[PDB]
């Protein structure tokens, strides 16, 4: 299944770069041995080459990830950004994407990858739930996301 724990959610401040977000969101996954040590660096490498900016409304979303061979156990870490930060567009668009919600994926199983992308697609199209992600605290977000993830593994 997919490991999603309380310190896999965190709010991030106003002055963080794309690389800071990656490293922060990956820190607890490394610490828990969910991923290899240089996992953040491969996510940055993969992002520089295959961007994951989703310009959905009302809140921009990003799905940074790397290769499944760098994963030891399935996990997801979630980031809420104080200010919007720009990601390059996933559909090859030249315009950057403002993003306030980040789903870092550390999935080694193809069936989880597709189940999780499908779920994220339904989630960012829920205008209500997106607006909650911008006001809930970490314990609320962790409680809400956790029960939803559990609905995928079954």
């Amino acid at each position, epitope marked *: 299944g997919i490991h999603f724990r309380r310190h896999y959610v965190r709010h991030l401040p106003k002055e963080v770069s794309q690389n800071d977000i990656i490293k922060a969101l990956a820190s607890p996954l490394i610490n828990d041995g969910m991923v290899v040590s240089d996992f953040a660096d491969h996510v940055i490498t993969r992002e520089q080459n295959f961007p994951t900016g*989703l310009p959905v409304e009302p809140v921009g979303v990003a*799905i940074p990830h790397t290769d*499944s*061979k760098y*994963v030891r156990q399935n996990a997801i870490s979630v980031g809420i950004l104080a200010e919007p930060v720009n990601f390059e567009d*996933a559909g090859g668009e030249p315009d950057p994407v403002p993003v306030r919600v980040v789903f870092m994926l550390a*999935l*080694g*199983n*193809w*069936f989880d*990858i*597709t*189940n999780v*992308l*499908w779920w994220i*697609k339904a989630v960012i199209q829920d205008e209500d739930f997106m607006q909650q992600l911008l006001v809930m605290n970490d314990d609320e977000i962790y409680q809400s996301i956790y029960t939803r993830i559990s609905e995928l593994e079954h």
Partner: antibody
Amino acid sequence: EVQLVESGGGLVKPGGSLRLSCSASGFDFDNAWMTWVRQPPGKGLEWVGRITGPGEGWSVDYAAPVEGRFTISRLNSINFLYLEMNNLRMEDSGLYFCARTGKYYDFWSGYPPGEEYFQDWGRGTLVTVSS
Amino acid sequence: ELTQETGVSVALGDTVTITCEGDSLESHYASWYQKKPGQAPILLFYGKNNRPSGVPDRFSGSASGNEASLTISGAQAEDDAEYYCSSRDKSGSRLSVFGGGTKLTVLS
């Protein structure tokens, strides 16, 4: 260069058994999904089954007419893929291909579990089932 | 589960479309293979718009409803061959399946 080399094909009587081998080189075999495909005489390509990778625990899916009689497995330390075939029937005769299998999923329009495609193929080994 | 036309003919230099039909194509993309007798299949196209590099640009794939298509723009004599589609046998399935194959005759 990618190379896939099948072996083990031959003549076998109805009801007997045969083990096909596929030697792989030139790519990350340990992490590759691998598929067996067969072509009956004068007929089309038929998907036989597919073994997944480490993240999936090397699980296998099989075509219905072959389920329970065929086993696919791998030995990653020597870069070999195997197909074991029991209670063979005349309609199992044909040319059996080894194929390195990619995975595809389009975020906005895809549906789980996406799609598998066959990006490198061997030349085949011939299986003749005949009394 | 995937149906193709048995055979099509094209004149040298023309454009031809080969199609593949099945319920699962409403949810999944098709991949496309060329095969000639005594030779390994070759992947021509997969997904929404993926042509593996090394495949000539005159090959292109598309999708609409329960059908997938391979288009060859400017058929060459090399293109005389059998063409196979492949996808999920059913929506959401872990299995795969091929169509029966279309024999393309290029009158050269």
